Amino acid sequence: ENLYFQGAMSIPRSQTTYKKKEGILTLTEDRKFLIWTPLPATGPPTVSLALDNITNLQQTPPGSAKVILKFTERPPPPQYMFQFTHPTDARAEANAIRDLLSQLLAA
């Protein structure tokens, strides 16, 4: 039917490295930007990517040496790689933020 729904669960926050620095990958509260902020995550984000401007999302396949999500932005287009570093939960974290993003992007 005609009902439209939006996500209403807590926005995932993920232990990730960007350009070899440790930080947190999340979305803004309005769910319009992907943000990455270096630890201690006191200050502003160093990466802020509008979901409107993401043209692709790729991942390392499960069982790869590294768990990595790769974002391509609208313009050799700009690209961003985030390595998921949680000792046990890396792939689950990647999957979660992937799943949210792909739901947002396909809407």
User: In this complex, which beta carbon is closest to Cl ion, that of residue 37 or of residue 83?
Assistant: 83
Smallest distance, Cl ion to C-beta of residue 79, A: 21
Nearer residue to Cl ion within complex by CB, 86 or 91:
91
Q: For residue 15, with 0-12 CB atoms within 10 Å meaning exposed, 13-18 middle and 19 or more buried, which class applies? A: middle
Instruction: Find, among 9, 13, 67, 70, the residue nearest to 37 by Cα.
Output: 13
Measured from the CB of residue 29, what is the shortest distance to Cl ion in angstroms? 29
Work out whether 76 is an interface residue with Cl ion (CB under 5 A).
no
Which member of 54, 91, 92, 95 binds Cl ion (CB under 5 A)? 91
- Residue 18's DSSP bridge partners are 21
For residue 40, cis peptide bond before it (omega within 30 degrees of 0)? yes
Between residue 32 and residue 71, which ones bind Cl ion under the rule CB under 5 A?
Answer: 62
Question: What does the binding site for Cl ion look like in residue numbers (CB under 5 A)?
Answer: 62, 91
